[PDB]
Every structure is written in C-alpha cells, then in structure tokens.
Amino acid sequence: DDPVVQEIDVYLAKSLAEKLYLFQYPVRPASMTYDDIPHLSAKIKPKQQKVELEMAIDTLNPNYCRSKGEQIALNVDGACADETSTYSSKLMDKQTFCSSQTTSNTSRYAAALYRQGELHLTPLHGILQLRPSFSYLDKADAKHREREAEQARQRRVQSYEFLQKKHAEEPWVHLHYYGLRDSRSEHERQYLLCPGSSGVENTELVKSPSEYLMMLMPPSQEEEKDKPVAPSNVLSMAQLRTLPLADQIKILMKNVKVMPFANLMSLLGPSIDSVAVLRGIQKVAMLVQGNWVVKSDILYPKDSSSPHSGVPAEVLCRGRDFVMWKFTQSRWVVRKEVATVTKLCAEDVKDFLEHMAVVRINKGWEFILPYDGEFIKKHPDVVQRQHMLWTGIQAKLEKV
Amino acid sequence: GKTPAEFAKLNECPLDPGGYFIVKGVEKVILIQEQLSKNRIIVEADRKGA
Amino acid sequence: CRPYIIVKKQKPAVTNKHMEELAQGYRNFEDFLHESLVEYLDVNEENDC
Amino acid sequence: APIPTVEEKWRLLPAFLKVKGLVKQHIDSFNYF
Amino acid sequence: MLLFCPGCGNGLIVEEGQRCHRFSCNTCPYVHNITRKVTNRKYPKLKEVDDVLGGAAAWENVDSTAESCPKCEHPRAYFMQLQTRSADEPMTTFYKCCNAQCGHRWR
Ligand SMILES: [Zn+2]
After folding, report:
1. E10: closest chain A residue by CA
2. Any idea which fold E56-107 has?
3. Are E25 and E5 in contact (CB under 8 A)?
C-alpha cells in the first residue's frame, strides 16, 4: 500500500505545556454552548487542581418562574439580612458549577491543533469534569435547621474530613474571564503554532524498534534469585548466552548419545567457529565409525552407582569402553553374551547396547547410524590421535 | 531424587505415587476441592420467578 | 488447561521433522511451547476456537 | 487431495507426562506452599 | 420517552397554574408552556381479556365463509383469529375442531 495523499508533518509547541486545560460537561449537549450566557466569577486552586465556576441565569425571560424563584430565595437566603447573601435580589441571580478530577497522570494525553499541511501538539496540564451544583438546597436545609434550633492508634488518615481540611489549607485564587467572542481568544490562539524550520532531523528518537519494544515491555524480573546450573534438561534450542559453548557441547552430548559432526554446526549455527568446537569435542567425544560418542564417565560419574532397576553395582565404565572398542573393531557386534566377557548382568548389557546399537533379528546388534566421510574435515591428525589413544586404552582394558 | 537401587534400602516401592501424608501411621490424602469463582456477575431467577 | 497443536492456513504447525528431533532427543516439550508450535487452552478460551 | 498426517503426534504425550500430568498437582502445590 | 431540563438536568413534570399547562422542573424555575402536539406514548398495560365474551356471546359476529378440515368435514366449525401480546407484534391464528373424545385443535 503506497502513499496516496497528505503526508502531513507534525510539530511540538512548548509555549503552553503547563498552561492548557480541558473542561467537559457530561450533562450538556455539545450543540448547546455556554458562550452566549455571560460569565461572572471563577475560582481555582493550583495544587489538587479544582475550580468553582459561577454562572449567571436570565430572570427577565418568561421561562423563569418568578414565584418559584422568590420561594427558593426565601428558603435559602435570610428574610432581610442581605449582608452576605447567595443572591443580591430576592430571586436567584446565578448558578454554580464544581469540578472533579479525572486521572492523576495526564502525560500520555495531548491537545492537537489542526492546520493545513501541519499539526501542532501541546501537552495538557490537566483534565477536569464540570457539573452543575445543587448546594443551595443544602444551604436552605441548614437555614431551616438553624431556624428550628494513651489515646488509641490514630486512624484519622483515612477520614474524609481530613481530606477536606487538607484541601481547605490551600488558599483560593480568583481568575478574570474572557469569552470566545473576545479577540483576546484569537490573540492567545497564536501561541499554539510553534515557529521553526519545516524540515528538521530531530536529535532525539534514536532508539531502533528493538530498543522501543524493550523499553515499553520491561523484563518481568530484574534479577533472579538462582543461577541456571542446568544439571537436568532445560530450554535447549535457544543457545543461552549465560551458558558457555563448552558446557553447551557437554549438555548436548549428555542428552543425545551419538551424533555426526554435521548436526553440530546445524544446531549451534554458523556464528560459532567450527575449529574451536573440536577442542570440546575431543574432551567429550571420540570417533567410532566416524561419529562421536560421549565418554562413559560423563554418563557415569565416579560417585554414582548402577541406577537401573536391575543389579546395583559399583560404577563400572569398563564394560562400556569394552563394547565401544568392539564397535570400533567391527561394523556390528554379534555377541549376545558380552556378559560372559565383562561379567555384568544381562540387563546391564542390554542397556549398554541400547544407547548406540539397534537389534537385527538373528544377527546380533548393529551400530545405530552409518559411516561418514571423516576425511572431508581436514583433521586426519586428530583421527590418528584418537586411534593410538584407543590403542592405549585397549592395552589398558586387556588386563581383564 | 533417589534411584531404585537406593529405594530398596528404605523399603519403598519405586512405583509408589507419593503425594500423601503419614500421620500416626495411617496414610491420609487431602482430596481436591471444587468451588465457584469469586468476583463474577450472576443473573438468577428467584424461586418466585423474579 | 489442555495443550493443542496450532493450525494456520490449513497446515498443522508441528511437522515430522520435529517428531524426529524429539525422538532423537534434540528438543523437549518446552521447546514446542517456546517456538509457538503448541499452546495451552482454558475452558473459557476454547469457547472461541 | 489427502491432507498428510503426522504419524508421531502421540509422542508428545509421554513428553508431557515427564514433567507434569499425574499426581504432580499435589506435589507442585505443596512445594509452592 | 422522557424529557430533561436543560438548566439542571432532571426529569420534569406537567402542571397547570395559569391559562395554559406547562412542562416544569421542580428544583429549578425552568418552565416551558406547552402549545402543540406530541405523537408518542409509554405504551400502557391492561391484562388478558379472555372470557369477556366466553361461550356464545352476542351473535352479531355471525360470519359466512370458513375453512375445512383435511380429514373429516362435518358442518360445524367456522373460522377465527386472534392476537398475541401488544401493539406492534404479530397476530396468531388457530383452527380448532370439536365433536368429542379427542384433542384436535390446529394452529
Ligand atoms: Zn431540576
């Protein structure tokens, strides 16, 4: 979807960042504006922003029930006191509005001024909701009533009159008013349009989308209470950064028993040096038939014992090395009775065959996976190293 | 974490499921309970149908 | 909860290669979870599936 | 055309049973407690 | 159908205290004297009239044409229709036959 039209730019104006407010009247239709009726008085408090707006009301018009208004004024105001009266005359001359705050934080809201080819934004200093007030009924009720007639743990924090007192601490501020009809409004309107070059490369906004996603989705845990030793199986397909490559190879050869060289670069990926992994491999594996097999001691640490439900015994890798040497000597081992040579129970022999061999009917056990072109990788030297190392291990094993 | 070989020393069955308590020699199982969710609007028709 | 295999445009997310890998031991179940191959579904959520 | 079938789907079930499933709810709850 | 005072936002009432009735609030002196018609209501409610003509009431409703049954067709059941609930919902019809010892009556 290519662009069609109106690639309009946007600019930020800081002139009125701490000066703009947004009033709204839930009870008043948008088609009925207040600009026509003259305004008289307004008040505000800077902290815990709230306002009190006083509105004049027409009395000469017929829809003003004069008798009802006189009754209301008599009910709310003194009969002849008039020293401090809510209304100057014997009828109500004004009605009042009160504000309610909406949300504590308004950082994510902004006021936008549209103009041909450009948008001018400005942060808001607050949002307030205005309603008409019915306090004059309360005043009338109060006048009617007055005509009729080792301390325990503190809990005053949660009381309403506490908050009323705290709000009353703040002194009132009186404001002058100018209507929308006044040219003063148009004059003040100029401050929205921030000046400057139309085309500017902003210095900020350098974060790439990856950093933005990181920023607006912070990690759930800032610090974990334990370290990932990973003795058992863990997330494998993700090459954990905290897990060094040597231990990666260790755990991988601990999981899968026999594996050709190619799948190693398949799994670690091409980012890792193919020559360095040789080190770990020769510490942790050897070429039987051109494919690596894990040491016995990695699977059988010297402080362990036969875990299988057959015969417990001291940890005897030598049987595994023996069958492994048999696999090196011949393509497949027909000997069912390896137990006769190495004297373990048959179940142990079957377990040992299981890791690296597969059954063929009436034909003994065969190596699980086939030969490979071991010379393709240019390390015949390590091949010879393995070869006479196994010559030495065979010499050692021949003692029994 | 014990292997069957070691299970044999403790006189326990490797197949045993576990998950119960032993109190004064008898094996006690705290069964799973079932209950309705809290903080949910329920519309219901009274016994009188209202 | 119950796990299910995700389907998109009439082909299951899992594939025989994944099953071969799991048989060989290259991966485990949680790998299927992380690669968006399977996911749990609750009674309420499976009302929409 | 016959949509092709993954024959080894069921192998996921033993994998799941290895870490969760049977009688593991009691033990996990008590461990958390 | 309901109205609200623009001055203070409350439900108004109708009252007469002068030469013409007026739509008036009660917490603010707003008055709007009515001088024209309005053409909608709250749809009032009176209960089910069932037996006000029960049996054979005034025979002024004798009619000629009637349908017939698909099975038997003796000369006695002329036609009928009635109504369901209220002003703006459909009107149901049933066709019912009665000699004795059955329970036939169609819709
Ligand atoms: Zn009112």
Report:
1. A27
2. N-terminal domain of TfIIb (2.20.25)
3. yes
